[PDB]
Amino acid sequence: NTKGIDEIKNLETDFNGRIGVYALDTGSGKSFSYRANERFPLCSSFKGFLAAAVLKGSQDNRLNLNQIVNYNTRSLEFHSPITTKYKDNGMSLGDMAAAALQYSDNGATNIILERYIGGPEGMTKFMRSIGDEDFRLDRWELDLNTAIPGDERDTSTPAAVAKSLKTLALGNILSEHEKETYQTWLKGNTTGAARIRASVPSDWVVGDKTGSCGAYGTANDYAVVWPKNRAPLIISVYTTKNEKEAKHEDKVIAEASRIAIDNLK
Ligand SMILES: *C(=O)[C@@H]([C@@H]1N[C@@H](C(=O)O)C(C)(C)S1)C(C)(C)O
């Protein structure tokens, strides 16, 4: 059978859940897919796209990344490591957008969704405008993390996630300068050491955004991977389980990425 398909099937069987993967080599055009068209919860992964929406607004001159966002009288959401630190005097919209991505900051995420993106509807609308028919954000943080089997709320497909990431990071939606900023933000992510980053050799450069729902063993990661002396790779790995109390498995996500990279065709 086709390279790596059985291996990913076996990984999935051992994991006892559902694994969805889509990897693309932008240099050769080769790819690897497994349940790439199935829905999986986005969890915090959508924040990487929220950052891109902010960048598009900047480019459109509908907003300015230098604008100081004040929230000294707003209580911050669970897991707001950066916004909590700067709550007294606020932070630029640019720094807040970066924090939402790099630290999965929930305060930054909800503040930006409210004041600049138009909430879940606006986020969904932005993705629709770039060609993504699958992505759907329906709830705010941290309600969007339920990850209930069969529930289509706050889900997307590994393929759609990959298509959108390539469109944003390597397409022409964002201008050259905004893409540089987006790629820089992705490269500075602090939460993906055990996922896609763990599947590639040390000299490859990774830019990613992880997502961990904390329910139904749901976790994911997507990334732009720059191999030494090669064109970028777009990797999208999403996983889920049927037990509500099951824990996520970083090793499984990493192995699915390794398999995909090694089996492009
Ligand atoms: C999103 O899934 C989650 C935050 N992001 C994950 C991750 O990126 O792996 C953390 C474990 C860092 S916390 C919540 C807190 C649900 O928004």
Swiss-Prot record:
Reactions this protein catalyses: a beta-lactam + H2O = a substituted beta-amino acid
InterPro entries, sorted: Beta-lactam/transpept-like (IPR012338), Beta-lactam_cat (IPR045155), Beta-lactam_class-A (IPR000871)
Domain of life according to the entry: Bacteria
Matches recorded under SUPFAM superfamilies: beta-lactamase/transpeptidase-like
Keywords of the record: Antibiotic resistance, Disulfide bond, Hydrolase, Signal
Cystine connections: C43-C213
EC id: 3.5.2.6
Pfam families reported for this sequence: Beta-lactamase2
Active site positions, chain numbering: S44 (acyl-ester intermediate)
Positions bound to substrate: K209, T210, G211
One MF annotation (Gene Ontology) recorded for this entry: beta-lactamase activity
Keyword check for 4Fe-4S: no
Gene Ontology biological process: beta-lactam antibiotic catabolic process; response to antibiotic
Cited function: Hydrolyzes carbapenems such as imipenem, which are extended-spectrum beta-lactam antibiotics.
Note: The class A beta-lactamase family has a specific amino-acid numbering system, sometimes called Ambler or ABL numbering and often misspelt as Amber. A multiple sequence alignment was used to derive a consensus sequence and then the consensus was numbered taking into account insertions and deletions. This allows use of identical numbers, e.g. for active site residues, despite differences in protein length. UniProt always uses natural numbering of residues, hence there appear to be differences in numbering between this entry and some papers.
Protein family according to the UniProt entry: Belongs to the class-A beta-lactamase family.
Protein name as it appears in the record: Imipenem-hydrolyzing beta-lactamase
Name of the gene encoding the protein in the UniProt record: nmcA
